[PDB]
């Protein structure tokens, strides 16, 4: 017949910030029973003020830039073209939906929480003798 | 709590929502809706073709209280119990006792409209 | 088999210099080589009373300090472990040191004025410094026994409550009840960086060679672990229910509510201990938020008052009913723990005057009793561990502070036997 | 005075250097003004003061710290070599 | 429009509404009401789309001990309350209390709410490690015990300001 | 704006201890009745109508 | 038939002492006997914490015939030492009182005590 023999790399790019949703791991920080860093009280909030407090997806963002800050020695700046939205936007973001540095965007979303996890999603016991091994 | 008539059952039905799971869509918060003495006994005076009405007004949910009247006449019923106490929130559509409770201060009417319900003299609609 | 992990590698093989940096776990088994029944338990009694703590500098001659409510730092000598603990110099404090203006950022009197409440040792040797409620952290040159710099805590409320230094290095932690923690440079006498989050008045904070410390609110039941450089923190949370206790019981005594966290010790990198006020010493593990291992009352019920004493009437028989029995009793606090690191041994103290002493369990999952070490008596406050000796005979010498009342205020009934001195004690092998 | 945290000290002997994050502590003043760390930072090591570069210093918001990297050579010869001109120049 | 007018703006009721609000409060304008207002309604609206929904479906067993628990930490749902049928009950003044014109003064310092507006915009009450000086900051739980006068304050343990040093170096000249 | 929000509710919370006789503070001195006066004929009660 | 009953739980010895040790601080804490009858006569106290181990049992035993009189509620806690670090006090405080301020940060968490003293009654 014919094949393509073509190497990708998007089976190899990591998928997981595209099925994560944020609700279900709040669920799993209470359950994980393992502690979870949080920081100091003053060290989150922005400009003394108007930004509201930090985001948990903020003090993580924030720290993958400082992890690679100190590996690089070097740092990064102004750009503007990605700067004009991902400065507007994403601190509008937070004074449309963060409410005392916890996020409350997540309740009106059209993402539904079944679509990730779906009875286990692919890897499904479709037979009967499936349905036997997980019982097993 | 919030006291109902014998109308806002009536236009309920043409306009397809639930009592309880209606009133919460523009009430945004949790109810008990119960309906007085006079105005089950107006409900069953409509007669045969009301009936279906008569049936969806007793629902364990919706909770009844009983009045010490001579009467069956419910929209003086009603408002007879708002004056004194102040904490219930009238369901009505009548265009009269619309009228009679506006004149009342600090009493939330609600009444049906379109698709779902309206309240007027909530401060705190959302 | 990774990319990334291999490049990993590679960067970090270059990477120097990094010994406090790395951590170290409980290598030190010498838990089972001490003997406590033939253990020497020698007792001091000084002519200062209420005394609050004590620490003792030990070189890479041994030292000892003390500190009472009469305002006196004291500077002592143990370093012959067959004798008892020796006076070199004194220096009592006063009311000539109050401050002039009394209200100012400056408190820069040089002596403590009002109710030193904890020492500590440099461990270099080179300098010791006090604190207490005067709101003043004196560092003191040892030889002269001077004050060498006296820091104003520049708050109001911030009254300090434990002296924390790093192992080998003068980074000096401080804990102050206004909910902050101060850290310090000695060596350049330098205020480091503050550090906030606890509920409640912080009373313990210990350290190791790492650039982390833990400290425990008092009422907040909450225990936290703590970076110094990058500023973030952990959360431990006890809350053991008693009807979780009991149900549990009922499926065949008494079970305590947790009033406070007092004491903490931090024995390796991994594991650490507290002490509560319902007499339970928790082992902590940092996986998990729940304690690794709760062991309820450890000195004990605290001694039930008599039953002439309570009612004020005659009838004798309705003296008992009073009491309502259990209901009335009470344990012991835990008002002193300490661990010598990185071992499998630590010491509780309290007013049960028995400094009773555990094994922690070799697989770091429960710990268990030694013995006890009946000769103090009354209130005990701190606890200083020094070693000597070879590398695997070792003798130790477990130095308590005893007073008649708590470091913190009096709360105390029925003291009896008990004097204000330095409990010295040596167990060998 | 001021004081200073180390983090990260990675050697690199292709450079002949010492390369290590710089955790400078401000307790009250305003600022460190990098040469008086390239006084401190010396006089921490054997470094004659020209054989450090300090640059990357962005503050701690609200003040009281700030965080950047240091460069300390061997040979101070080399800092003529392989630092950049407008390095040179402060 | 990070805030949506009323559908009813100017009633008998709504106008005496935003007279308390902003009287007890300390507001400055009828705006920072709607800010509350929008977003309280965006919650309430998201608790009764997980009670249209059945106990043991996820998106009402995860998001609600999302929601309780994020109540919770910002201090406005008591923990006592961790039902969804509480979340619904919470009326906008929960929300109030927690500014920090209100819990200023509702914690002391203060004398009043307009004087705690007062002490915030100058930067005088700090929150942990940074000074904050917004009032309507919305202290979550944790940070409550917190508050207290800046180490940089004259009302704290700083130098007098101005008007003091002024008149303190005034009376040595006079005198 | 903040002031004339101040201004009125405290000019509104004088008409509001004339329209009803609102609750304050308890009773913090010694003496017992009333200031003001009795009358005998108000009856300031809300009668249960039938 | 005990004279210190309503004693309390040890869960709602927790519950109470910590909310004692917040009021400490907001100064709504009043403290000792003496000073827990004079609200009482004020009217003004939320509800009365009561040290059992006091010797004796009678010395303040007045305040229950005085808050059922007023209908203010009123606990045992079995302590007095430990009633003393939940005052903020160098020796054991045996008798405490909540005052009525409206303005209370602890407003929300004092009624949740309130409610679970008047459970016990
Ligand atoms: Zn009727």
Known sequence: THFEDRFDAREHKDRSNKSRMQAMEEYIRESSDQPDWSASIGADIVNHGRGGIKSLRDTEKERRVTSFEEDNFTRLNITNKAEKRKQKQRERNARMNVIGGEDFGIFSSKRKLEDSTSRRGAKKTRSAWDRAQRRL | ?126 | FDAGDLDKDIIASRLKEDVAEQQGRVFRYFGDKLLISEAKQSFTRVGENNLTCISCFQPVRLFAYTVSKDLQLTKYDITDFSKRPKKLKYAKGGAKYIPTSKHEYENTTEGHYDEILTVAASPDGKYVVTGGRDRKLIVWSTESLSPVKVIPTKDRRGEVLSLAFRKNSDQLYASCADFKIRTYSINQFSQLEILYGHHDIVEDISALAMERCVTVGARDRTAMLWKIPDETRLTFRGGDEPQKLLRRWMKEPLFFCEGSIDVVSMVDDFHFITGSDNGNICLWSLAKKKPIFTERIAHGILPEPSFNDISGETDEELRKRQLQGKKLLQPFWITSLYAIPYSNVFISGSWSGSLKVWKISDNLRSFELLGELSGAKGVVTKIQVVESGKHGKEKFRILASIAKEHRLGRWIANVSGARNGIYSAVIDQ | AVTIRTRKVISNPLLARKQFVVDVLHPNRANVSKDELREKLAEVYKAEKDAVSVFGFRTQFGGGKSVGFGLVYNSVAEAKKFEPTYRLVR | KTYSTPKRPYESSRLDAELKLAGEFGLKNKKEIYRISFQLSKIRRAARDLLTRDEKDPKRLFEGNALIRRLVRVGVLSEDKKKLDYVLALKVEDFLERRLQTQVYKLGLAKSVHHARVLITQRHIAVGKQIVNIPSFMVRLDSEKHIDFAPTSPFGGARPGRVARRNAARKAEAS | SRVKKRKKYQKAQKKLKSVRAVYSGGQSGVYEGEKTGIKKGLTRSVKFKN | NPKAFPLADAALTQQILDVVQQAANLRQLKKGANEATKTLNRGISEFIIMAADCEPIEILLHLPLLCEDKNVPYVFVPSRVALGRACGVSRPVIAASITTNDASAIKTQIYAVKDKIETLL
């Open chain 2, 1 to 126: 709590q919030v006291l109902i008539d014998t109308n806002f059952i009536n236009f309920s039905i043409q306009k397809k929502v639930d009592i309880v799971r209606g009133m919460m869509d523009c009430l945004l918060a949790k109810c008990n809706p119960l309906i007085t003495d006079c105005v089950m006994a107006e409900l069953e005076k409509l007669g045969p073709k009301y009936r279906i009405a008569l049936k969806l007004a007793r629902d364990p949910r919706i909770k009844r209280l009983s009045c010490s009247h001579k009467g069956t006449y419910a929209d003086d019923c009603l408002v007879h119990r708002v004056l004194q106490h102040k904490c219930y929130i009238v369901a009505t559509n009548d265009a009269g006792l619309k009228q009679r409770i506006r004149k009342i201060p600090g009493i939330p009417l609600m009444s049906v409209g379109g698709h779902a319900y309206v309240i007027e003299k909530l401060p705190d609609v959302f």
